[PDB]
Paper text:
In mammals this process critically depends on the interaction between [name], a protein exposed on the equatorial segment of acrosome-reacted sperm, and the egg plasma-membrane-anchored receptor Juno 1, 2. Juno and Izumo are structurally unrelated: Juno adopts a modified folate receptor family fold, whereas [name] is a type I transmembrane protein consisting of an extracellular region of about 300 residues and a short cytoplasmic tail. [name] is not considered a fusogen per se because it cannot induce membrane fusion when heterologously expressed in commonly used cell lines. The molecular mechanism triggering gamete fusion is unresolved because both [name] and Juno lack sequence similarity to known membrane fusogens.
Here we report the crystal structure of [name], which reveals a membrane distal region composed of a four-helix bundle connected to a carboxy-terminal immunoglobulin (Ig)-like domain through a β-hairpin stabilized by disulfide bonds. The structure shows that the Izumo domain consists of a four-helix bundle with a flexible α-helical hook/β-sheet insertion, followed by a β-hairpin that connects the bundle to a seven-stranded Ig-like domain. These features result in an elongated architecture stabilized by five intramolecular disulfide bonds that are conserved in the three Izumo paralogs, and are clearly discernible within the sequence of Spaca6, another sperm surface protein recently reported to be required for gamete fusion. The helical character of the carboxy-terminal half of the Izumo domain, which corresponds to helices α3 and α4 in our structure, was shown to be important for the function of [name]. The structure readily explains why mutation of leucine residues to proline interferes with this biological activity by disrupting the fold of the four-helix bundle. Strikingly, structural homology searches revealed a high confidence match between the four-helix bundle of [name] and that of SPECT1, a secreted Plasmodium protein that is essential for host cell traversal by the infective sporozoite form of the parasite (Dali Z-score 6.9, RMSD 3.3 Å over 98 residues). In addition, the β-hairpin of [name] is structurally similar to the extensible β-ribbon of TRAP, another Plasmodium protein that mediates sporozoite gliding and host cell invasion (RMSD 1.4 Å over 19 residues). The presence of solvent-exposed bulk aromatic residues in the [name] four-helix bundle (a feature also observed in SPECT1) and the report that some monoclonal antibodies that target the Izumo domain do not block binding of sperm to the egg but hinder gamete fusion are consistent with the possibility that an additional, as yet unknown, component is required to form a functional fusogenic complex. Our findings suggest that the four-helix bundle of the Izumo domain and SPECT1 may orchestrate analogous fusion-related molecular recognition events at the sperm–egg and parasite–host cell interfaces.
Residue numbers in the entry: 22 to 256
């Protein structure tokens, strides 16, 4: 994906136009660049089987790849290497940066990608072949689970709808908190960007089932959490 970052392409433009003259004879420049560009364009391109894990990467990981690649390309720019050794080390550095990228993508999937164990997440991915930003939808069963909440009388009742991955998810609209009646109907008791609901000075009338549903601009509901609230005596 590094080809998708303006800093990499500008870096290669300066490398070809300015820095190559220092290291190598002019007449071998173009061919060298061809190879360089070829290798830089092969970054992240998928061979099927497992390789699909390199076809797309989040903006942050693309940033890491960009900056390590630029670090090495600058190292070689500043090296005393020339001729055959400069070419050998250049191609080796491209192969090594390709390894670094592969590691960053593999890692990105293991941890960063589809971290949600429930609900629907939306992550901005860069597809490396065409350099296209798309919204990747990690879709799992919308209902995340049921919380058993117990609160003494005249205390604060807090319903926490926040999930780990929520902060990272894209396109989140407001959380909506509903009260689910024994009659099998519900009324919205709150809506807004706050991940939680607070009800003050609860009483037995507040005992019951509650529900939290997070909404998105496009994809749908991101998360649902149900709450079973039992009001205890004051002491
Ligand atoms: C049940 O439903 C009715 C209308 O369907 C609603 O007005 C009422 O407040 C609800 N209350 C209980 C205790 O079920």
């Amino acid at each position: 994906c590094i080809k998708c970052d303006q800093f990499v392409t500008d870096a290669l433009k300066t490398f070809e136009n300015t820095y190559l003259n220092d290291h190598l004879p002019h007449d071998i420049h173009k061919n060298v660049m061809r190879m360089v560009n070829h290798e830089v364009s092969s970054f992240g391109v998928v061979t099927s089987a497992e390789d699909s894990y390199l076809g797309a990467v989040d903006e942050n990981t693309l940033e890491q790849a960009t900056w390590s690649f630029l670090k090495d390309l600058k190292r070689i720019t500043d090296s005393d290497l020339k001729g055959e050794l400069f070419i050998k080390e250049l191609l080796w550095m491209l192969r090594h940066q390709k390894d670094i990228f592969n590691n960053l993508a593999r890692q990105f999937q293991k941890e960063v990608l589809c971290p949600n164990k429930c609900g629907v997440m939306s992550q901005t991915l860069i597809w490396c072949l065409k350099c296209e930003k798309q919204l990747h939808i990690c879709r799992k069963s919308l209902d995340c689970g049921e919380r058993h909440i117990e609160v003494h009388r005249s205390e604060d009742l807090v319903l926490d709808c926040l999930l780990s991955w929520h902060r990272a998810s894209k396109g989140l609209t407001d959380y909506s908190f509903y009260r689910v009646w024994e009659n099998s109907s519900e009324t919205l008791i709150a809506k807004g960007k706050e991940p939680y609901l607070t009800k003050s000075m609860v009483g037995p009338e507040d005992a019951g089932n509650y529900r939290c549903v997070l909404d998105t601009i496009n994809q749908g509901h991101a998360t649902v959490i149900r709450y079973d609230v039992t009001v205890l005596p004051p002491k």
